[model samples]
Target: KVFGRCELAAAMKRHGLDNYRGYSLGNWVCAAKFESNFNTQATNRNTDGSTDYGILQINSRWWCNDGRTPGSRNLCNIPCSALLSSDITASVNCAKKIVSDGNGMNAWVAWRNRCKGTDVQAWIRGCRL
Candidate 1:
């Protein structure tokens, strides 16, 4: 599923992403915009032979087990394919674990380059959340 801007915002908040790791919710929304364009089925193969999956593009190297990435920890204990579900529950949960593990939002270069220090508030300007 491809979520509208506000729809994504609501979903994130519902899943407890709001300031989950001292990062604003809008920043997360911004990361999603640059990461996967809010598409649940998005996936990107990295040059390192790892794959990123789902809307936030969680990586196979550390988060999910795709049965291919070498030395995958599968810290989230879920298959990479599960991240592609439109439901987004697993995606969000895995994201929380990523941050909770001390990686913070820097786990995604997209967030570091695009959503890091901007006035991310505009990403959810009219979301009413």
Candidate 2:
């Protein structure tokens, strides 16, 4: 677990996600909150026999290889467990690439289903950057 919203914002900015592809810290924060509540070790079992890992809840279908999931398109070349690290550097890098190279933040189901409408500024209310 890291500090909180502002800390994550600062770290993300330092990591060059301050102005991520067109996303603000609020959008990211909202997604993270709904996805894992800032717990990096978060995991969820999908009905498709796959698992989502980390704060962003990255699915094993296209990113990581959990070993048990056959035919995983592990483009990240990383173990699914690695996303469970508190450091989160690897997951952030992967997410940035995915959101950028892919179809943008809409790739994140959380962003689409929940964090959409873009009224997400309150997510960083007290600890805003």
Candidate 3:
């Protein structure tokens, strides 16, 4: 399901993502905005022949294997479809786990390409988090 930006931010906060795993709430929100435009059901195929899943746009290459997508390593131990669900629990926790492994937001291409060097905090500015 598609949701508003503020609604997403509120949900992220509830997930303890207002601050966690070496990223600010703004960076997280910005990544989500650019990745899927707040669409929980969003998915996109990368130019390299991999698919990105859900609101965080996780790549299918290493994170999932649904049997439909080829050459997936299924590293995250969850189906790609699980990440597409509106609940977002799988997606959010997987995201945290990924970053918690001493990795940074660079895993999210949207974060690297659009938000890494910019003022990401503005994505959630005045949202009353």
Cα shift from native, residue 37, model 1 (Å): 0.7
lDDT of 2 by residue, 1-129 (tens): 744777776666677765588888788888888888888888999989989999889989889999878777887889989999878787888888788766888888888999988788777677735
After superposition, the stretches of candidate 2 with alpha carbons farther than 4 Å from their true spots are: none
| Regions of model 3 farther than 4 Å from truth | none
- Model 2 TM-score, all chains together: 0.89
Clashing residue pairs in all predictions, respectively, total 0, 0, 0
Error of 1 at 24 (Å): 1.4
lDDT tens readout by residue for model 1, 67-90:
999987799999999999989899
> Residue 42 error for model 2, in Å?
0.4
Per-residue lDDT tens digits of candidate 3, residues 46-104? Answer: 78788888999887888877676666688789988999998988889878877775558
Kindly provide the TM-score of model 1 when superposed on the true structure, using C-alpha atoms: 0.96
By the TM-score metric, which is better: model 1 or model 2? 1
Residue 8 displacement (Å), model 2: 1.9
Error of 1 at 14 (Å): 0.6
TM-score for all predictions? 0.96, 0.89, 0.89
Where does candidate 3 have its weakest 10-residue lDDT segment?
63-72
Query: Judged by lDDT against the true structure, how good is candidate 2?
Result: 0.82
